[PDB]
Ligand binder design. Structure first.
Ligand SMILES: CCCCCCCCCCCCCCCCCC(=O)OC[C@H](COP(=O)(O)OCCN)OC(=O)CCCCCCCCCCCCCCCCC
Ligand SMILES: [Zn+2]
Lengths: 49, 117, 460, 49, 487, 51
């Protein structure tokens, strides 16, 4: 029985699973939501001014 | 220029012996007044000098901080053995400054920077 | 600009070279002071210039020990005309590469850039070798890196041993160490290097060698800068004698517990090394004939998979992990031997399995004539494939006008490998074992035999 | 120290603010009940002004 | 009664420092005539002549390219294939590397011992290497054994046998080859970087494959790989040295007659399974290891992209510093001056990889665990500055260095032939030396900022780290510093 | 700093083969295989009533 952290440095698999209890992921092959994330943060920086 | 040379001017040969008189009573040289905390280039000129030359500087500075706490001067036997204006620092400091003017005309980051207080 | 599968429109194209460009011949010129400029053209777009000096680690009296391992680290630094900041920025401005190396008999400084930059490449190389100031704050920061690498040299146990088959084994100059110890790094400063160079870097010991430069260009640049060095008499060459010797060092106290293993080696001697030309080419054939390797390297058809030390040692004794021959030829003396690692519980018979193989080639009938032809084909091609680089070519014009005063054509090297027969392999290897056995060891030293237990198994 | 400068927040003029208000290491599972202490320092500034 | 200036040891050790400095004051103007520390841009047209590259396409689709140099005494000839690890299916993931080691062992005409002896009797070599998109088999011989060398490469690529006694003895050579490349730590960083940047794509897999795949692979699979991929439009025969073009063409026209005939090209296989970049990270913390290693990467350009030449000029601006180097504190690159002056790393290196559809651009570094904050500040500060503020001496020096390093590398018969064979597979042609120099100096300070704004500015990154890395900053620290909230 | 017990131990290893060549003051690697259970059963075997 190999340690779990030892058997993960020896096998670089390209199928990674994250924790999906709080956030679901956009499926691979989608654009980034960077422009939407800027315009929500502007309409509150309007308010603090 | 032409108003600072003491073997042509008369009022520069009396400014010269006024600082020469005041340095002898503490036994200091004119280069001992250069502080490595004032100018970061003076800190570098002293690291390139031999250990025996920097050690005599640290012992002239300790003898003089001891004479001013006690409010006295060197005895006049030791005062005739003193050489102010015999330098050890001006040529090495001009070399460090000449290397810094070359690293700036040609691009290149400075080798040491001052900390912002 | 178009994508890179479509040609760009508006560019001039040079007219190409023919399919058969005739090769050039080496031109050698001797100046009145004794310096020798040597040049040869080529068919690439790049040049390679080097400067080679006769000095080395055998000119080291006990006041200047370690003073050529340090001259390799002080190589392209502040001169009387350029600071160390201007030297680094001038080499990077043209996209060059600069390098130095030191031997027991040769120092060498090299440069290579494109052929447009030949007048720049020459005057930086001459100034960095002819006019070094040695400033104490630059020497002291190079000494502190040599002191932190003599802290550990125990991770290369084939130059630990190869230096230990040289001190134990010689007496005079050839026993001077190349990479020095901790105490001779404490007597070294910028004035020891300064007068070691002003004495040992003279005009009758300097050769400039170019590859890819026309000979009349190299004389318009390098002659007005080297002609005024003074003509001095050369010194007398340092002498030593080949005695025998044993050496052993049980390893540094943390290397074992299923760890150090074993590293031993044997050696011999043969009086001339390069001024007796006929004998040295026999021993290079005998090196590729014996050969061998570490055998867990996985290349291909190639290096040594059908050598004597491969299919008669490691192919049936699996406890070996490395066995290979080695030659260290110099200018009059020479050294031939065999380096072995094995296990600690499998050691003393590995001396046995080693020695017989040196006894097998001393016999006149054990070697085939199908094994001799393989070692003579694999030797003529290794010389020919290695000479394709422009850097090996310039290094050949340097180290041959320091030994013979002229460059020998490569046709005379392929002519004299043809002549070797099955009896020259036997006679010179019988003149090899007539000299005392040099032994060295490292690792677990306790389980090995001693000097006279082995040296009387040969002759004397 | 180092030989030349770096991020300006690691300078002496802003070290006490960096190591105590920006880079200060905090347990990662603190809930919203750990939020009423900075809220009480805002209520004290409102009363003074 | 002042002491004379030789009487005290400290007074006469000071007249010897003033005499060492007076020989730095009178420079010789004949040693300063050609060299200059300011970079300029120059013309290299007179020296750029070369022999002619002749390409010939056979009617089955096979291409034969040569560069002849008839005064040499050696030659290099080999086969370049457009196939690799990307074109497998995760149940055959180690197949193209296993087939490489099992191809010098077969052949009904010559067994393993006979093939090994024919090469060594001539005095030749025979190599092979695999990558994610390309395979090579080539040989270095003398000029009179070129028809024998080409006879062996055609027979081991067409008529190889794979027997079970040889297959199972190669399963223990490769399973021990895996174990030694688990301790190099530069091939381990770059292998976890590909698995996290190109996850759920075929470009993310490793070359050697999982260890369970290797003990399952049998001849069945080796033979469908060599009948699906090793076909005539995806193969290039390249020769360089003392060869003649018209004599090699007639040899390959009668030796290569029996390879397969599937009409699938490589571009139909890249387009139905493309490669997609994802911003993500992997961190492997151990704390018993003394040094830490990591790499941070942006997405880059493909092979035929016109912006590829500008991402090679930019890589020469970031540079490389090592602790043994003679440049020291005086290098051209400003990232190498930050690392070098403050001693915040052991080594630093910028990389740039190209592929058929994607690429990778970044920096790799090795350092001590208490230096990781000031090192990560300096790396991110100088990469983002390429989108804002580009000096003109920076690009002239980085253009002079890329021109010189691409040509100083082509030295001998084997660097020439791998230049021909690899460029016919990626560009479809060999680019002459005068066009390639013309595309490099068309990259000025305004071109740098425009490609930096496309690839670097406000973009996702991928990180892989290993060692004592508890003081390396986190992902939100790195992602924020891809832009400057100050200009 | 004691070159007369450095030598007196070195006239003992070089010179004997078996037991009398075992070193008294040991090196760095045999201090890494020693713990409290090696000492514990070395004593339970070698400290007996007839000795
Ligand atoms: C109104 C003038 C406007 C400016 C025009 C310039 C005027 C020309 C004349 C002055 C220029 C040269 C001044 C220096 C000459 C004398 C050098 C000197 O050091 O004099 C010695 C005096 C005392 O020295 P000490 O030996 O220590 O005292 C004991 C005496 N056995 O040391 C001293 O005390 C120095 C003597 C003057 C001190 C005050 C100097 C500043 C006041 C006038 C300048 C006003 C500023 C405007 C510029
Ligand atoms: Zn392999």
């Amino acid at each position: 029985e190999i340690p779990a952290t030892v058997a993960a440095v020896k096998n670089p698999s390209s199928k990674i699973v994250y924790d999906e209890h709080n956030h679901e992921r956009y499926p691979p092959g989608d654009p980034s939501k960077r422009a939407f994330a800027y315009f929500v943060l502007t309409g509150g920086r309007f308010v603090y001014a | 220029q032409s108003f600072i040379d003491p073997k042509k001017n008369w009022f520069a040969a009396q400014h010269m012996k006024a600082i020469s008189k005041r340095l002898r009573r503490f036994g200091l040289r004119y280069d001992d007044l250069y502080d490595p905390y004032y100018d970061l280039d003076v800190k570098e000129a002293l690291n390139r000098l031999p250990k025996e030359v920097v050690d005599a500087r640290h012992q002239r500075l300790k003898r003089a901080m001891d004479l001013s706490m006690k409010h006295e001067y060197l005895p006049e036997d030791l005062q005739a053995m003193q050489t102010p204006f015999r330098g050890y620092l001006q040529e090495m400091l001009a070399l460090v400054k000449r290397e810094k003017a070359e690293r700036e005309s040609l691009g290149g980051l400075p080798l040491y920077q001052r900390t912002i207080p | 600009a178009p994508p890179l599968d479509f040609p760009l429109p508006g560019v001039t194209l040079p007219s190409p070279l023919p399919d058969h460009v005739a090769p050039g011949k080496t031109i050698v010129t001797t100046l009145p002071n004794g310096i020798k400029l040597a040049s040869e053209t080529s068919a690439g777009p790049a040049a390679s210039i080097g400067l080679y000096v006769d000095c080395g680690s055998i000119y080291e009296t006990p006041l200047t020990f370690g003073a050529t391992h340090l001259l390799e680290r002080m190589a392209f630094k502040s001169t009387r005309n350029r600071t160390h900041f201007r030297v680094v920025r001038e080499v990077e401005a043209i996209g060059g590469n600069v390098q130095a190396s030191a031997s027991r008999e040769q120092m060498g400084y090299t440069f290579d850039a494109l052929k447009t930059h030949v007048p720049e490449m020459v005057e930086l190389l001459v100034d960095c070798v002819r006019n070094p100031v040695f400033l104490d704050w630059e020497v002291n920061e190079q000494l502190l890196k040599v002191k932190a690498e003599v802290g550990e040299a125990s991770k290369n146990p084939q130059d630990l041993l190869l230096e230990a088959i040289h001190s134990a084994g010689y007496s005079g100059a050839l026993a001077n160490p190349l990479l020095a110890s901790e105490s001779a790094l404490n007597g070294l400063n910028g004035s020891i290097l300064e007068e070691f160079v002003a004495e040992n870097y003279t005009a009758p010991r300097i050769v400039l060698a170019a590859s890819g430069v026309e000979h009349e260009e190299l004389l318009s640049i390098a002659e007005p800068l080297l002609s005024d060095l003074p003509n001095v008499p050369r010194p007398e060459e340092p002498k030593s004698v080949y005695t025998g010797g044993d050496y052993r060092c049980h390893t540094e106290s943390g290397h074992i517990l299923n760890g150090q293993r074993t590293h031993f080696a044997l050696a011999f001697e043969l009086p001339g090394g390069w001024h007796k030309l006929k004998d040295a080419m026999v021993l290079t054939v005998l090196q590729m004939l014996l050969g061998g390797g570490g055998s867990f390297s996985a290349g291909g058809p190639g290096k040594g998979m059908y050598s004597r030390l491969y299919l008669r040692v490691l192919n049936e004794y699996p406890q070996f992990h490395s066995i290979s021959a080695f030659n260290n030829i110099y200018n009059n003396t020479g050294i031939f031997g065999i380096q072995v690692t094995t296990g600690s519980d499998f050691v003393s018979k590995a001396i046995d399995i080693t020695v017989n193989e040196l006894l097998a080639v001393a016999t006149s009938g054990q070697v085939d004539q199908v094994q001799l032809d393989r070692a003579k084909q694999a030797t003529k091609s290794a010389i020919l494939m290695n000479l394709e680089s422009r850097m090996v070519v310039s290094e050949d014009i340097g180290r041959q006008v320091l030994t013979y005063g002229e460059r020998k054509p490569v046709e005379d090297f392929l002519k004299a490998v043809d002549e070797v027969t099955l009896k020259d392999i036997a006679s010179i290897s019988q003149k090899l074992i007539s000299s005392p056995l040099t032994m060295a060891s490292y690792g677990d030293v306790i389980y090995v035999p001693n000097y006279e237990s082995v040296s009387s198994k040969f002759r004397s | 120290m180092r030989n030349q400068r770096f991020s300006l927040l690691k300078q002496p003029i802003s070290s006490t603010l960096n190591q105590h208000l920006i880079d200060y290491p905090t347990p990662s599972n603190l809930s919203y009940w750990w939020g009423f202490g900075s809220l009480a320092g805002i209520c004290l500034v409102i009363q003074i002004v | 009664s002042p002491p004379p200036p030789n009487a005290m040891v400290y007074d006469r050790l000071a007249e010897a420092v003033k005499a060492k400095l007076r020989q730095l004051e009178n420079p010789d103007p004949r040693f300063l005539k050609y060299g200059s520390p300011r970079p300029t841009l120059t013309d290299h047209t007179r020296i750029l002549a070369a022999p002619e590259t002749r390409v010939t396409t056979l009617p089955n689709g096979l291409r034969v390219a040569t560069e002849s140099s008839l005064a040499a005494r050696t030659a290099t000839v080999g086969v370049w294939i457009d196939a690799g690890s990307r074109f497998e299916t995760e149940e055959s993931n180690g197949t193209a590397h296993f087939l490489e080691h099992m191809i010098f062992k077969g052949t009904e005409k010559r067994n393993a011992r006979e093939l090994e002896e024919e090469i060594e009797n001539m005095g030749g070599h025979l190599n092979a290497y695999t990558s994610r998109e390309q395979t090579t088999y080539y040989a270095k011989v003398a000029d009179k054994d070129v028809p024998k060398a080409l006879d062996i490469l055609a027979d081991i690529l067409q008529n190889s046998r794979f027997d079970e006694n040889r297959i199972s003895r190669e399963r223990d050579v490769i399973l021990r080859e895996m174990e030694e490349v688990e301790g190099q730590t530069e091939e381990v960083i770059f292998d976890h970087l590909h698995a996290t940047a190109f996850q759920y794509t075929p470009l993310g897999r490793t070359i050697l494959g999982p260890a369970q795949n290797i003990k399952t692979i049998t001849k069945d699979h080796l033979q469908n790989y060599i009948q699906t991929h090793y076909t005539a439009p995806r193969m290039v025969i390249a020769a360089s040295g003392a060869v003649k073009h018209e004599d090699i063409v007639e040899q390959v026209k009668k030796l290569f007659t029996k390879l397969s005939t599937d009409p699938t090209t490589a571009s139909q296989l890249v387009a139905k399974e493309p490669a997609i970049f994802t911003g993500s990270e992997v961190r492997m913390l151990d704390d018993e290891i003394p040094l830490a290693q990591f790499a941070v990467a942006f997405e880059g350009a493909s092979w035929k992209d016109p912006d590829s030449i500008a991402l090679m000029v930019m890589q020469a601006m970031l540079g490389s510093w090592n602790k043994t180097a003679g440049g020291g504190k005086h290098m051209g690159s400003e990232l190498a001056q930050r690392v070098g002056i403050n001693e915040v790393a052991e080594s630093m290196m910028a990389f740039n990889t190209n592929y058929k559809d994607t690429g990778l651009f970044g920096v790799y570094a090795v350092a001590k665990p208490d230096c990781l904050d000031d090192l990560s500040y300096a790396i991110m500060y100088e990469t983002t500055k390429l989108a804002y503020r580009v000096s003109d001496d920076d690009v002239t020096r980085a253009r002079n260095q890329l021109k010189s390093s691409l040509l100083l590398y082509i030295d001998g018969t084997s660097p020439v032939a791998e230049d021909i064979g690899r460029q016919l597979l990626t560009y479809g042609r060999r680019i002459p030396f005068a066009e390639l120099f013309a595309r490099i100096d068309a990259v000025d300070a305004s071109t740098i900022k425009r490609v930096a704004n496309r690839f670097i500015y406000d973009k996702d990154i991928a990180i892989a780290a290993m060692g004592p890395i508890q003081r390396l900053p986190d992902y939100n620290w790195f992602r924020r510093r891809t832009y400057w909230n100050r200009y």
